[PDB]
Design a binder for this molecule. Structure first.
Ligand SMILES: O=C(O)CCC(=O)C(=O)O
Ligand SMILES: O=C(O)CCC(=O)C(=O)O
Ligand SMILES: [Zn+2]
Ligand SMILES: [Zn+2]
Lengths: 13, 341, 341, 13
């Protein structure tokens, strides 16, 4: 699962 | 061929050109235009599917908000707090405050300040009058504290269209809607996101410059643990070619969006956004969706964005293993010096 | 202080010095002597515990094999096959044949050839007589096909001592015993192993040069997927300081072991082993044990060998993710260029 | 388990 990703953007989570 | 945003569009009713080239900042790289199409155009559907940018001109996505403006909003947006960034420069580089502890040597050029909408409008008026030069940029997520009229407008958005998009692309769920109101000249430095984004322009014009995920090598994002993770380290206004040689090979896709246009910014795609010079304030609302679920088994060759996902994970893993993010670089260098370089 | 192997020991019965400095090859780096102690010496127990090299002079570990020699062995070792490496150089760089497929551009300077012990002795005799210059190095794991006399000797080894060591250090189990028989001048290039090792000298003398795991940056091991994984890329006889600058900072621990001595080579420690020039053939038998189990939770700071374990794992993981080992380097470089270097 | 290790040496497994 090295291709797994998060969902961060230019805004507070 | 590298015409950039292309010939300035003509506003209906012979009201002159929407904008003129002199309102765009000058950069050292070339750019090709992003396609401007109709939501009914098969090509537009094809671009979104292949995760490529496209500007949709008639989605009516935020039709009800096209009437929004400072006065209207200050009267119906509510009494909740709004995050307002202040800077003495046109560049509003984004930073993660939660990571500021691991990098005490980082000094933000922009400061965040919570306040009421009316306070933002006041401070905004206070600036224009005294002829000051400090810039402001409001960036607040649409929450439950908005007035009933704003909620009404929100309900009027074209959910039938966007919900079908979400479904057709297999995307996750809508995580949020960011309200952006900035001053003319304001610039958000190049960066990329881990979510799919429909960028809905409402007031004013914005020049958007995107770079495919495969340009990772030319854009030099900051270290993952640094506060500016996902942001480019290159100062577009004064490119340091000694530290960032490959920025000389960068090629972008650009466009100028105005009221009614919706720009699809695919996940992982870098994007630089600037409010046209002397174009007045700008208003935008985005729609951030979680990407589709990572495949069961990967197929080769691997896509550019997948390699980016891997590098990010390696950095995160190393930071946890070493028990200290500042040790990530020395270990990485030790790994490659004289062995892979 | 950097006396290397130190003053050549005197053989009992006034039989002259065991060896003389002229039998040692010349290298560009300094070295300090490894401690020579008694198995009953508290300091020796302390060194093994702290995973530091020590030469034990009276363990009687392979007492029964001290009588071994080509004739005796050729008469009791059996009819099984023995791996014999042949090279036109004194350096016998080790390589993993299973990884040779991922690196078709690698051309081994030594070739392996199976044969019967008597065949090895014959070919060995065939060389000395004709005055040839090709070198041979037998390296075979002691299996169940050895004669009854050899098995008898094996049983006579000091298992009471080594088994207590295994227990005291919490090591895993004995994985194997390598039988090494080489010609004078033979050299095994610097490398490290993932197992604990008691190196038992039986015939002839060997100069052993070790480097602590924290010298990883000065020794430039080959990429993990390369056939020479764990081996140093630096040619000790002609150091390329342009590619391997930090090899100028390397500092080793050396010693000369002879019949009866046992050198503890801690896991992860680099070691270069050479049979003394004009010292005749050499015979050695090692005892490879699995290291103790990796701790439940890691404590900081992290030990040098733990960081090496991490780098190796990152390389292995990347090779599997990218689905191709040759892509490991480009991805690693992309990760650090302009970001961590 | 990034500190985990194998048991390879200069001999066939
Ligand atoms: O419009 C801007 O200035 C920033 C927008 C942005 O980065 C986004 O919606 O992802
Ligand atoms: O003695 C030699 O030449 C090689 C030995 C070795 O590398 C070992 O026992 O680990
Ligand atoms: Zn963004
Ligand atoms: Zn070894």
């Amino acid at each position: 699962q090295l291709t797994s990703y998060d969902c961060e953007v230019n805004a507070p989570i | 061929v590298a015409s950039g945003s292309g010939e300035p569009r003509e506003e209906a009713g012979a009201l002159g050109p929407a904008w003129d080239e002199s309102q765009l900042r000058s950069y050292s790289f070339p750019t090709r235009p992003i396609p401007r199409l109709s939501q009914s155009d098969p090509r537009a559907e094809e671009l979104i599917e292949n995760e490529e940018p496209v500007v949709l001109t008639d989605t009516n996505l935020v039709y009800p908000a096209l009437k929004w403006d400072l006065e209207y909003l200050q009267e119906n947006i509510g009494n909740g707090d709004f995050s307002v960034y202040s800077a003495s420069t046109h560049k509003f580089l984004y930073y993660d405050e939660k990571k500021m502890a691991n990098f005490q040597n980082f000094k933000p050029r922009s400061n965040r300040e919570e306040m009421k909408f009316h306070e933002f409008v006041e401070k905004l008026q206070d600036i224009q009058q005294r002829g000051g030069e400090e810039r402001l940029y409001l960036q607040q997520t649409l929450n439950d504290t908005v007035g009933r009229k704003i909620v009404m407008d929100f309900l009027g958005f074209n959910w039938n269209w966007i919900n079908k998009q979400q479904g057709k692309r297999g995307w996750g769920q809508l995580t949020s809607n960011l309200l952006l109101i900035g001053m003319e000249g304001n610039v958000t430095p190049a960066h990329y996101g881990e979510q799919q984004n429909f960028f809905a322009q409402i007031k004013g014009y914005k020049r958007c410059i995107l770079f495919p995920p495969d340009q990772f090598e030319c854009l030099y994002p900051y270290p993952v643990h640094h506060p500016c993770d996902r942001q480019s380290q290159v100062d577009f206004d004064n490119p340091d070619y000694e530290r960032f040689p490959n920025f000389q090979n960068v090629v972008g896709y650009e466009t100028v969006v105005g009221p009614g246009d919706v720009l699809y910014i695919p996940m992982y795609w870098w994007h630089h956004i600037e409010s046209l010079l002397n174009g007045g304030i700008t208003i935008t609302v985005n729609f951030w969706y979680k990407g589709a679920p990572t495949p069961k088994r990967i197929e080769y060759p691997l896509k550019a964005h997948q390699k980016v996902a891997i590098m990010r994970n390696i950095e995160k893993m190393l930071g946890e293993a070493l028990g200290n993010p500042q040790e990530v670089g020395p270990l990485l260098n030790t790994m490659i010096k004289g062995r892979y370089n």
